[PDB]
Structures are given as structure tokens and as C-alpha cells.
Design a protein around this ligand. Structure first.
Ligand SMILES: C[C@@H]1C[C@@H]([C@H](O)CC2CC(=O)NC(=O)C2)C(=O)[C@@H](C)C1
Ligand SMILES: [Mg+2]
Ligand SMILES: [Mg+2]
Ligand SMILES: [Mg+2]
Ligand SMILES: [Mg+2]
Ligand SMILES: [Mg+2]
Ligand SMILES: [Mg+2]
Ligand SMILES: [Mg+2]
Ligand SMILES: [Mg+2]
Ligand SMILES: [Mg+2]
Ligand SMILES: [Mg+2]
Ligand SMILES: [Mg+2]
Ligand SMILES: [Mg+2]
Ligand SMILES: [Mg+2]
Ligand SMILES: [Mg+2]
Ligand SMILES: [Mg+2]
Ligand SMILES: [Mg+2]
Ligand SMILES: [Mg+2]
Ligand SMILES: [Mg+2]
Ligand SMILES: [Mg+2]
Ligand SMILES: [Mg+2]
Ligand SMILES: [Mg+2]
Ligand SMILES: [Mg+2]
Ligand SMILES: [Mg+2]
Ligand SMILES: [Mg+2]
Ligand SMILES: [Mg+2]
Ligand SMILES: [Mg+2]
Ligand SMILES: [Mg+2]
Ligand SMILES: [Mg+2]
Ligand SMILES: [Mg+2]
Ligand SMILES: [Mg+2]
Ligand SMILES: [Mg+2]
Ligand SMILES: [Mg+2]
Ligand SMILES: [Mg+2]
Ligand SMILES: [Mg+2]
Ligand SMILES: [Mg+2]
Ligand SMILES: [Mg+2]
Ligand SMILES: [Mg+2]
Ligand SMILES: [Mg+2]
Ligand SMILES: [Mg+2]
Ligand SMILES: [Mg+2]
Ligand SMILES: [Mg+2]
Ligand SMILES: [Mg+2]
Ligand SMILES: [Mg+2]
Ligand SMILES: [Mg+2]
Ligand SMILES: [Mg+2]
Ligand SMILES: [Mg+2]
Ligand SMILES: [Mg+2]
Ligand SMILES: [Mg+2]
Ligand SMILES: [Mg+2]
Ligand SMILES: [Mg+2]
Ligand SMILES: [Mg+2]
Ligand SMILES: [Mg+2]
Ligand SMILES: [Mg+2]
Ligand SMILES: [Mg+2]
Ligand SMILES: [Mg+2]
Ligand SMILES: [Mg+2]
Ligand SMILES: [Mg+2]
Ligand SMILES: [Mg+2]
Ligand SMILES: [Mg+2]
Ligand SMILES: [Mg+2]
Ligand SMILES: [Mg+2]
Ligand SMILES: [Mg+2]
Ligand SMILES: [Mg+2]
Ligand SMILES: [Mg+2]
Ligand SMILES: [Mg+2]
Ligand SMILES: [Zn+2]
Lengths: 98, 50, 251
RNA sequence: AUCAGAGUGGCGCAGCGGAAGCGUGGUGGGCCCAUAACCCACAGGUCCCAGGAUCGAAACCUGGCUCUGAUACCA
RNA sequence: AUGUAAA
RNA sequence: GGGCGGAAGACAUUGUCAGGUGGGGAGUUUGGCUGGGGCGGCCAAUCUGUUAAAAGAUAACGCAGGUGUCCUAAGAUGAGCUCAACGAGAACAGAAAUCUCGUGUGGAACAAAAGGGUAAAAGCUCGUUUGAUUCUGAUUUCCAGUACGAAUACGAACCGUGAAAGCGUGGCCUAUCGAUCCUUUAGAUCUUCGGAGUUUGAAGCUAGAGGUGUCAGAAAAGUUACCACAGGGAUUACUGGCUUGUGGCAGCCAAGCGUUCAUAGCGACGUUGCUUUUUGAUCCUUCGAUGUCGGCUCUUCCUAUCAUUGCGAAGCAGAAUUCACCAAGUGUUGGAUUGUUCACCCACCAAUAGGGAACGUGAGCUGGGUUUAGACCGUCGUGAGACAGGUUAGUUUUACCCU
RNA sequence: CCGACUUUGUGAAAUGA
RNA sequence: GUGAUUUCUGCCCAGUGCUCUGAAUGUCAAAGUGAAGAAAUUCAACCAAGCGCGGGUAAACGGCGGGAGUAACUAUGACUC
RNA sequence: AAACUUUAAAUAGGUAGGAUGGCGCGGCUGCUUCGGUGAGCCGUGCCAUGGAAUCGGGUGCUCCAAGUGGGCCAUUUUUGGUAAGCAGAACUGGCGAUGCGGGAUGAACCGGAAGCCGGGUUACGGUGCCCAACUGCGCGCUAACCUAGAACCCACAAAGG
RNA sequence: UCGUUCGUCUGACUUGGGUAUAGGGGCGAAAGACUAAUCGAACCAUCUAGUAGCUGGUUCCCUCCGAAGUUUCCCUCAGGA
RNA sequence: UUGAAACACGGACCAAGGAGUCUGACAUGCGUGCGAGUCGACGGGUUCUGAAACCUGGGAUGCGCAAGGAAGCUGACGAGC
């Protein structure tokens, strides 16, 4: 599934509130941080004896994710993000269909 | 031991033995859900009756 | 499972050494001035069979160097010793079968037995029936010597380690087939409770890693690792190879 | 009985939609007194029977068949 | 590698 | 000479963290539906058609199939055009290449399964595009009138396209999907860090994603024949019961066989049954126990008659033999092999017909088989072990009660 | 099994800073 | 582990396991090292054993195939593919 | 022709049958229209013999809570199955929870549902004896040398002579 | 346990007493055998009135009303909301 | 239990013992006291049969009288058919 690099949708910033021109990117999960309360809790809980305390997931079933598009308008430099339907292959600015 | 069972047998009896309760028809029927463009007007007139 | 015989032997319960009729520790003399710096004359009195050991023992009656009494020492008989023989101890003992000399005084090529390892630990190598160590070479810049042990290994020992020249008696003993479970039993009563020895494959799983199964088989590799926990380290331990030994590997 | 597998040159097997080959055999020559062997060339097939889609099948899938292999237990 | 049974 | 004599020597080693190995050991798990269970399959999410009995709802391991995708166009819209096929024609050109005219109710296409829908379009080509956007509700479908998914109709914006009406909150409609906690991201020039501040970090609020396919969402492999417990006839293997496809037994028709002659004796192609000694099917009684194969023993009963008494028919000359009739009174054997019922042989015989009685008969025997614990082989399993494979050893309890 | 810290002091050279 | 004596123990080190070697530029903890920071901290380099790469080992656990054609009667198949 | 249909039933489905209705007057709107144009509401005044039959007090409103969530049979429609006293559905009723009279005997077939008694009359079913009631009045067929035949379910008989 | 019959009997033989090993431990010429009539984990006391969606019982009278085996969800179908 | 006289289980007989209780939180229904208040519950004083009774404090103890927010914070301007 191909999506254009640059798209005109609504920008909610109190400065724009109109269709502007948004650059597109792809959402990629930022890196997990060592100081989040959930992480210092789990690292406290895992410490000691008793082994694995929180469950760990094994029976994976999905093969595809929902893409999230991080659209940045060229006008106030604020992002807003939109998830599209599930797909296997995904490419921004691919050669157009003929 | 077939744990899948299904009938409607006796369900009409349970329904009807205490009637099929119709709701009380109402003077001043409810407006919730109506067209907001119609209801704003309707409210505002009643705001400015005399 | 339950604790396995290889693990039960470390308790001492019934597996201790059957040593009621053994004649005592068979070892050299407490190294002293006289036998550092000369020779002491001792006379064999009897060649006594030591129970539970194939090598005969020789009662040697030294004269105490500085008190007025005899010293009944007790050696491992070197093939050749007889009652009435004079065995001499020390550094200037003549190189005669039965005398004990430091290795600084055994010419290269000579056979020795009962080799000490820390000077004065009274004999540890080449002691069992009919085994000997050959003094391969000397190094006087460090005061050490080298020997070829019975095992085919080659050990550097201090040049002042003593040794009985000759070879231990009782040699050739393990050539005779025992032919009888009876002979085997009477062999092992006087050593220790280690016979009859049951195949693991004919055990139940709860007491041996090879156990159980509608057929008798091991079911997994019989070679176990060096670090395997006690109770798992049964089989062939840390084996470099298996199968019949052919060629150079049989050296 | 179900579950799979393979059906492709005369033989045994390759094969990923543009679509036919590997080894061996067949054919005509050459070396040879002659046959091999070897050297140079030449022809190959209903891609198991009936379909469908599909730029496009022999392959994807579905029906019709033959051989082969599996799991077929507590009473 | 090999060499009509047909004299 | 203030060293007992050596050997190693600030390495081994003790203590604590840190990584790998660790069924040696501990703990636990080892889903559900199911015409018993296991294996198979997914009938657990979920779509279309049918069953579904002309509103709705409607089940089964019912039928025929589908789905976990694909798409910046195959979304929006505006304009223009008509699709499959068939008739006739045109250099190479033919059944089929490209062109022209006519007819063409859709017999084409609409991404996919099926159903429904469409002809100045919903199809084909081109034009400009991003409504596949923002906020929060409503309603339907499921339904407890809960959530989710999906869908519809308004509202307040901002927009696209068209001259405009209008259409447009994704795909022509019906399936194509995801809760709590956690992590991560977007936003306000937001709030808190509680002694007040500056200043990184952390938690917040609103909206997304990472996924639970057992799909309203535990983190989880086997074996037990050495087995234990609470239970179950909600549930198997024996008996019986209903059923009788399968098994056995008998009719009707008559194409032909019977050297000429359908019916002496057959009787194909079809068809009508009977029976309940097999098996199938079910799971109604029985799981706080009904002792489970066979043989031996003994008795009784059935006729669907093998022999024997009387008869009828013949492809009955006599002998033998075949078909049927009233007939169940009497009879139906000794043995090799097998644990066998079954089977097959040898011999006698007038004949060596078939059947039931809880597949008669274990407080009547026997324990050969089977059906525990020992053990062995063969295949499977990495293994503990399995075998509806073969083998060998393996306790048979009580009556004195009522009839 | 292995590394680091620790008991663990004394002094010498060679390569690195 | 096999189980007197006689006789003999064929092939496989790809699978699983065991074991040996580490040039070193794969992977790789704590500690210690450097840089940025106002500091918490983050980053990078270094980085043992172990795995990974490379040898051996079956009297280690174990395993040891199909399909076609062919002899001058037929069959069969010494032979071939 | 269950996964075909032009046509197209029967039974079953929905809605309406007035007092919660209409008409006049004069007012509101920030909606709607070219516009008093509409849409609706608001205040007021008038009307409206009760707007088919029958029947009758209501879940009208709410609270707290029990037990249940194994079903089974029948007439009819119906899916798998050769069929089943089988498995799964649709409408209703029954048994379960229920006695009583009849079908000899039977949970659900026929009649019928009940306080305890006296009197009368019936339903289903019967009147030869068991056993309460007729060996009643009539008319036909059957003669069974097989156990003639004799109750809705119901305890079968077929093809064929 | 009894009877007749059997295996072995100078041997790895039979046996008394002392002593050693005591429970996930012991000991085993290996049968999961033996460890006080108890062993695929003894006995005793305690936590302990362990838990059970499972089986059995659940005690006086009259009066009146009086059902359900059905929808939806749940590792859910012997259960519960 | 869909179905019991069951060839389904328990039951030889008698006597006595024998099984929905008590406690903390909550909820609806009802009674009683007071009612924008109500509680005297932990304490104190008293109490000549008393572990009872009676008095006392609360001007903020609990609940209620005010809610929305995650938090900073804000907090009901007086109803018609
Ligand atoms: C990998 C992550 C796992 C999962 C989640 O972390 C599991 C949690 C949720 C829960 O129920 N409590 C727990 O402790 C486990 C989740 O959210 C998915 C989106 C993806
Ligand atoms: Mg730790
Ligand atoms: Mg049910
Ligand atoms: Mg022993
Ligand atoms: Mg041995
Ligand atoms: Mg052995
Ligand atoms: Mg064994
Ligand atoms: Mg083990
Ligand atoms: Mg074993
Ligand atoms: Mg094996
Ligand atoms: Mg040629
Ligand atoms: Mg040639
Ligand atoms: Mg030749
Ligand atoms: Mg374990
Ligand atoms: Mg367990
Ligand atoms: Mg199950
Ligand atoms: Mg089944
Ligand atoms: Mg579910
Ligand atoms: Mg319908
Ligand atoms: Mg158009
Ligand atoms: Mg909803
Ligand atoms: Mg719109
Ligand atoms: Mg479209
Ligand atoms: Mg969070
Ligand atoms: Mg603070
Ligand atoms: Mg999510
Ligand atoms: Mg078992
Ligand atoms: Mg065993
Ligand atoms: Mg039953
Ligand atoms: Mg039949
Ligand atoms: Mg038949
Ligand atoms: Mg049964
Ligand atoms: Mg039973
Ligand atoms: Mg009996
Ligand atoms: Mg007869
Ligand atoms: Mg009997
Ligand atoms: Mg037996
Ligand atoms: Mg056995
Ligand atoms: Mg067996
Ligand atoms: Mg071996
Ligand atoms: Mg043996
Ligand atoms: Mg071998
Ligand atoms: Mg290897
Ligand atoms: Mg290998
Ligand atoms: Mg590190
Ligand atoms: Mg390393
Ligand atoms: Mg018609
Ligand atoms: Mg209907
Ligand atoms: Mg109508
Ligand atoms: Mg009366
Ligand atoms: Mg009478
Ligand atoms: Mg005896
Ligand atoms: Mg003795
Ligand atoms: Mg003794
Ligand atoms: Mg005992
Ligand atoms: Mg109790
Ligand atoms: Mg108890
Ligand atoms: Mg409940
Ligand atoms: Mg029952
Ligand atoms: Mg009975
Ligand atoms: Mg019983
Ligand atoms: Mg019971
Ligand atoms: Mg009893
Ligand atoms: Mg009492
Ligand atoms: Mg107060
Ligand atoms: Mg009022
Ligand atoms: Zn902007």
C-alpha cells in the first residue's frame, strides 16, 4: 500500500485550524526508557527470588500491524498522527500506479 | 451430555404470562435525539415567549 | 529420583575401607639428619602379607638414631628383598635393590619405587604390586628430576625425594583370571564394599539416569560433561573419545 | 478407513507464472578391417483426465484416476 | 576393450 | 647466628556481587467442543446462500463456500462514453491480432467467496484531487437492548470536486478484528512533585499504536500397567431393550440355463418381506461392582428338518440323488492341530443339521486365553513409556439364610 | 566453570598512556 | 556397557551429545575507562567464562534408500542407467 | 430444482379505528422561505353523543430476594440417519410439579384438573361372566380342518395369489 | 499356615549377639524390593474443622401464591454471573 | 433423576446426641427516638443489691448538610408545561 509523502488534512493547532500541507512519516515506537514508573516497579518486582512474576507473552497470532502516520504540517511544526488499516507492505512516495 | 442445547419452547409462555408490557404512551413525547437544528430553534422561541 | 549409588558412596556408611586386619601404613622413615647426611643400617625381619594389598610388606627394624630403642618400620617390599637382608637408608646408600636413596643419587635409567613427592611424605608413586618409575633425567640447576610413572606420565619431582630401588613385589598378579565370582567376592571383602556392581540400565529411573524403559538402553549420550552436578555425572565422564582404542590413540 | 506424497522425453528426475530441460537412451555422420568407447551434429514431449481464475499454466486452487508412504488406542 | 556357429 | 624443616607465594583460598551451565533438585502446567475419550477437524472470531416451515428468532461434527488480506487508487467527484456476445466487411490476417457499421436488458465489469444492486452508471477513459480530516454525542446490527467491530442520520468546523444542484466522515452493500495493567507517541506556550523557587526527571489529562486468533482477551509439554482421591450410568467396553443397514432365511415377476421345453431343478434384471445367534447405530437400566472368552457337566426349549416313520413331484427304469408336505417323538459321535467359538482334516455312522435359555451354566470346576504388578524381543518415542504385535511366570474367597 | 572487588603487602623491567 | 569358551565385531562424526584448540576484526555481564552534562544519568570504547566458527570421537546416544531396464524358449537377473 | 424462478396461496406479521382530536384569534424563533413562506411552539376561545364487536381493574411504578439454567412425550412442519424407544430445530399443549374416571397393566393417548360431605346428571368408555349397565330392538357379511376376530396412541404385517 | 512333593547343603553357605546408615533419607546380586502386618516416599503430633464447581443428610403443623431446563458472557458445558 | 416399586443407592430394630448458627462491612423492607441534625460508642462524676442504672462532654468525633475535577482549583444567581 502506497501513501503520498505530503498530504493536506486538518491541523488542529490553535494557530492553524484549517487544511494545511502535512509532511508524512511512519510511526516507529521510541525506545523503552529505564526510568518509567512501570519499569522501576517491574524491576523492583523481578528482583529477588520467585523468578518471572509478570506474565510474558508467547501465543502471538497477528502477522500485521496498524501503520501510524506521523503527519507534520509545514506551518506550525506540530505533529498529528493517524492510523491506517492493517497491511503487510507499506511505502511512502512509491511510484504511482499506471 | 451434548452441552449445546437450544429451544424457544416455553419462551412465549414466559413472555406472555405477564403480558407483553407496552410502554405508557405519553403526552409531551420525548425530544432527545431529535434534530439539533430543530431543537435549538424550539428552545429559543420558548426562551422568548411573552 | 533418589540419591544414586555413586552419590551414596561418599557418606561412609557401609563404603568405608575394610581395614581390620591391615598391618598399618606402609611408608618410608621419618627423614632426619642421619638419613639426610649419611646412611642408616636396618635389617629386614619378616615379609608379611598385608591384607587388602597385593604388595607384600617388609618389617624393617632400624636402630633409633638418638634414643635407645628399635624402630619397627614397615616398607613396601621390592621384588628381591629377603629376611636377613640389610637395607640402608640415606643419601650415601649404595645403589642396591632394597636400599632407599634420594633421586640426587639414582643414575639416569634406574628403576625405583615408592617415590616420595614432597621430600619426606614417605612414598607415593610406584607402590602397587609390580610397578616402578624410571628416573629419566636430572636438572641440577633447579635441583629437580624427572620420572616416568607407571601411568606413562612424566613428573618432575624434587631431586631430594627418596625412592626404593628395584620394583615392587607381587608383580604379574593381575594376569591370572579369577574365574569365579567367589574369587571376586573374597577379593573385595578385604578392600571395600564395592561389589557386586549393578548395571544402571537395569535400574528404575528414580535411582539411575540410565534407568527404566520397555527395553534396556541408555536413551541418551552416555558421555557426560565435567561440570555435571553430582548425581548426573554417571556414565563416561568427560570422555575425549570412545570405542575400541586403535592406532596412536592406544599409546 | 482417513491424512499426506508423486505423476513432466523411450527410462529415472529437474523445475519460482516470459512458456522444457538434467543424466541416459534414439537418429545421421566421423575415427575403426569391424563393434563398442570417443568426436561432431539432429529430432523430443497429449507437462496424469475435466475445469476455473489468472497480462500469462505444466505449477494456484478445485473436481476425475493410479501407485507409494503414514496414524489406526483404553476395553 | 573386443572379434564367423555358417566348415 | 633471636627462623623447627620444607614447598607454593601475594597466586591459590575465605567473603560478595556479576555472567554461562545446571531435570542433579524444587514448584507447577499440560484449553474447550466431541453421538465415550484419543487422534482427526474448528462447527470457539466470522461472511454469504440453503436448512429456516412467505414478518423476526431458529440448532446439529448439516450442506456449498469465505475471511485474518488487497488498494493514493481498486477512495472523492465531475465530464464523456457502453459492456459480453452475435451478423456483415477490410492488405499480408486464418478460429483468434487492428479497423468500420448494425443488433445488442446487461447475458460484461464492479480486487476477493456467495447473494443482492447498477447502463448518459455503481461499469470503461480522462480531468482536479485527499471527506481515508477535526470534536463529542445519537441510532441500528449483536444484545443483557452491555462492550467491541461495522454501519447510518444529524450537529459545529475546515475542505475537495462540479458552472451548479448536490455528492463526499474510505472501498456499491453484506466479513476483513482487539479490554484492564504496562511501554511508546501526538497536544496545550495545561496540572502535580505537597517548605518557596529556578531546572533535568517522573506521574498526570485527551486521542492513538505494541495483543491477546482459546479471538469479552491464564504466562504453561508428556507419561503412568506402580498409580491415588471426589464423583459419574450426565459417559465406554458385557447383558437386555428400540432399530436391522450388515449377517442369516423365504417369496413375486420371468430374460435365459435346463441337448427341442420359462417354472423337474434353477432363475439374472428388479422387487416384497421375515428373523434377531453376528456386526453396525444408539446410550434407555446398571460404574457405594450384575464376576467378562473358551472347554468340561447337565437340563430344558425352537424349527428355518440332516437322519429316522408316512407321503407328493422329477430331466423317478432299478440303485442313488434333488425339491417340497404333517411332522421336533428319537438321534446327531471318537479324534490330530488351535486357548479358541469358528475352521480343517482322518474314521465310524442311518446322520455326523442349525438354534436359544443374561452371546444358559466361575459361592459348579479349569484359568489355556484375556485383564494388574516381574521379564524379553520387534516397530514407535530423545525420554518417562505405547502397541487392537509375539512371548513366559502370574491368589479364583462365603452359603449355615429365603425360595 | 569464569570475571571483578576483598584478605593483598614488597620492587623490577618491557609495552600503553 | 556387554556378560563364560569358540568365532567375529561391517559403514556413518551430517543429527544429539562429549571433547581439544583460540591468530583474532562475530556475539558477550558486573566491575573498572573516556566523553557530554549543573547532577541524576546517558553514550561509546574495552570486555572473562559460555555460545558461535574449526578438528576428533560410535565396544557415545543412535542410523544404515528407492525407481527402472537386461541372458538366444519361459522364468530369473550375473550386467547397465 | 433446498442453495431456480415470471406468477404466487393458507396460517402467521405490522399499523389505524378520536377526549393524547380539530378550527379560529395573536404571539416567539438565534430554524426555514423570494416572501407570513413554512415548521414548530406559546397564550386564548370555541367545538368534538365518546367514534367497530366483545371483555375486564391494572405491572401502573419500584424495591429486596428465592429456586431454575440436565429436560422428556405428543399431533403437525422439518434437518442427519437405512432406521431407532436416535441426534437437532419451528408452533402449541402436556409430564416434570398432578391427583381422579377410561385405554386390563403404562408420566406425558382419550375425558378431565381437586377444600370436606349429602343429592342429581354427565365426559371418555362400556352393558356375556369376572364388573356397575341390555344375553335389548333391527339389518347385512364371516364359518377361520393356521390360535378366525374383537379399542386412538398400541404393541405391526408386505409384494402377490 | 498345613500336608505330600521339591531347590541347595564346604559353599558368593546358615545363623546369635554388638555396632553403622533414619525419610526425599537409608539400603538394595535391582523386584521400586525392604526401612516393625504401613513404602512409586514410613510412623507420630501440629498448621487443621486444610480445600472440593463432587456424593450423602439437612429435624413441627395449617394457610396462600407458586415456576425453570431458556437468551448472553466466562479454560465455559457436573459450575457461576 | 426427563423417568423409582425398581434387577438404582442408604435403610435390621430401639433409645439418646445430630446439621443455615455467631461476628465485621453493606443493602432493601419494617418499627422506634429525634429530625438539618443525629449519634455519649473512647473517657469523667456518680452508683450502699449492681460489670446495672443516671448525669456530663461536641464549638465541628462519624455519618449528613455540596458537587465537579486526574490535580492546580472552582463550587449550585432562586422553574415552567
Ligand atoms: C507485549 C504487550 C503485552 C500485553 C501486556 O503487557 C500484558 C499485560 C496485561 C495484563 O493483563 N496484565 C499483565 O501483567 C500482562 C499488552 O498490553 C500488549 C499490547 C503487548
Ligand atoms: Mg538477583
Ligand atoms: Mg444446557
Ligand atoms: Mg555389596
Ligand atoms: Mg564388572
Ligand atoms: Mg554388570
Ligand atoms: Mg527393572
Ligand atoms: Mg532421573
Ligand atoms: Mg533406562
Ligand atoms: Mg531408540
Ligand atoms: Mg550413430
Ligand atoms: Mg563404433
Ligand atoms: Mg564380449
Ligand atoms: Mg520436575
Ligand atoms: Mg502436581
Ligand atoms: Mg474435554
Ligand atoms: Mg467421539
Ligand atoms: Mg469466547
Ligand atoms: Mg424468516
Ligand atoms: Mg458520470
Ligand atoms: Mg453499542
Ligand atoms: Mg456532510
Ligand atoms: Mg469504488
Ligand atoms: Mg501509562
Ligand atoms: Mg516535598
Ligand atoms: Mg490498544
Ligand atoms: Mg497406563
Ligand atoms: Mg516396573
Ligand atoms: Mg445412562
Ligand atoms: Mg434384516
Ligand atoms: Mg440383508
Ligand atoms: Mg452404555
Ligand atoms: Mg458399573
Ligand atoms: Mg449373580
Ligand atoms: Mg415345519
Ligand atoms: Mg452362579
Ligand atoms: Mg495365565
Ligand atoms: Mg505384567
Ligand atoms: Mg504386550
Ligand atoms: Mg555399548
Ligand atoms: Mg544377563
Ligand atoms: Mg559397532
Ligand atoms: Mg558430532
Ligand atoms: Mg552424525
Ligand atoms: Mg558492561
Ligand atoms: Mg570469550
Ligand atoms: Mg407460476
Ligand atoms: Mg414464520
Ligand atoms: Mg394484518
Ligand atoms: Mg353422586
Ligand atoms: Mg353387572
Ligand atoms: Mg509348606
Ligand atoms: Mg556369622
Ligand atoms: Mg548376623
Ligand atoms: Mg512391612
Ligand atoms: Mg465442615
Ligand atoms: Mg478434614
Ligand atoms: Mg446463579
Ligand atoms: Mg439416567
Ligand atoms: Mg428392573
Ligand atoms: Mg447395584
Ligand atoms: Mg451413589
Ligand atoms: Mg444396606
Ligand atoms: Mg433427640
Ligand atoms: Mg456533629
Ligand atoms: Mg405540575
Ligand atoms: Zn499547524
Amino acid at each position: 500500500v502506497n501513501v503520498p509523502k505530503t498530504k493536506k488534512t486538518y491541523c488542529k493547532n490553535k494557530e492553524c485550524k484549517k487544511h494545511t500541507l502535512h509532511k508524512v512519516t511512519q510511526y516507529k515506537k521510541g525506545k523503552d526508557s529505564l526510568s518509567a514508573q512501570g519499569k522501576r516497579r517491574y524491576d523492583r518486582k523481578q528482583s529477588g527470588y520467585g523468578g518471572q512474576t509478570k506474565p510474558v507473552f508467547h501465543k502471538k497470532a497477528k502477522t500485521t500491524k496498524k501503520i501510524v502516520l506521523k503527519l507534520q504540517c509545514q506551518s506550525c511544526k506540530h505533529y498529528s498522527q493517524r492510523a491506517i488499516k492493517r497491511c503487510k507492505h507499506f511505502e511512502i512516495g512509491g511510484d504511482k500506479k499506471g | 451430555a451434548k452441552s449445546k442445547n437450544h429451544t424457544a419452547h416455553n419462551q412465549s409462555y414466559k413472555a406472555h404470562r405477564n403480558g407483553i408490557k407496552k410502554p405508557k404512551r405519553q403526552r409531551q413525547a420525548s425530544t432527545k435525539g431529535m434534530d439539533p437544528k430543530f431543537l435549538r430553534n424550539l428552545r429559543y422561541s420558548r426562551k422568548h415567549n411573552v | 529420583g533418589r540419591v544414586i549409588r555413586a552419590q551414596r558412596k561418599g557418606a561412609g556408611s557401609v563404603f568405608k575401607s575394610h581395614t581390620h586386619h591391615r598391618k598399618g601404613p606402609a611408608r618410608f622413615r621419618s627423614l632426619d639428619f642421619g638419613e639426610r647426611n649419611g646412611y642408616l643400617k636396618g635389617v629386614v625381619t619378616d615379609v608379611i602379607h598385608d591384607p587388602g594389598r597385593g604388595a607384600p610388606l617388609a618389617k624393617v627394624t632400624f636402630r633409633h638414631p638418638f634414643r635407645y630403642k628399635h624402630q619397627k618400620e614397615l616398607f613396601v617390599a621390592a621384588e628381591g628383598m629377603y629376611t636377613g637382608q640389610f637395607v640402608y637408608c640415606g643419601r650415601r646408600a649404595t645403589l642396591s635393590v632394597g636400599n632407599v636413596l634420594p633421586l640426587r643419587s639414582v643414575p639416569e635409567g634406574g628403576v625405583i619405587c615408592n617415590v616420595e613427592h614432597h621430600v619426606g611424605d614417605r612414598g607415593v608413586f610406584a607402590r602397587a604390586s609390580g610397578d616402578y618409575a624410571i628416573v629419566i633425567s636430572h636438572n641440577p640447576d633447579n635441583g629437580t628430576s624427572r620420572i616416568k610413572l607407571p601411568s606413562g606420565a612424566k613428573k618432575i619431582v624434587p631431586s631430594s625425594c627418596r625412592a626404593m630401588i628395584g620394583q615392587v613385589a607381587g608383580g604379574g598378579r593381575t594376569e591370572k583370571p579369577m574365574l569365579k565370582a567367589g574369587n571376586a567376592y573374597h577379593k573385595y571383602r578385604v578392600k571395600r564394599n564395592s561389589w557386586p556392581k549393578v548395571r544402571g540400565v537395569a535400574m528404575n529411573p528414580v535411582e539411575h539416569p540410565h534407568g527404566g524403559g520397555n527395553h534396556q538402553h541408555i536413551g541418551h549420550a552416555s558421555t557426560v560433561r565435567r561440570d555435571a552436578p553430582p548425581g548426573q555425572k554417571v556414565g563416561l565422564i568427560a570422555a575425549r573419545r570412545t570405542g575400541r582404542l586403535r592406532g596412536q590413540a592406544a599409546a
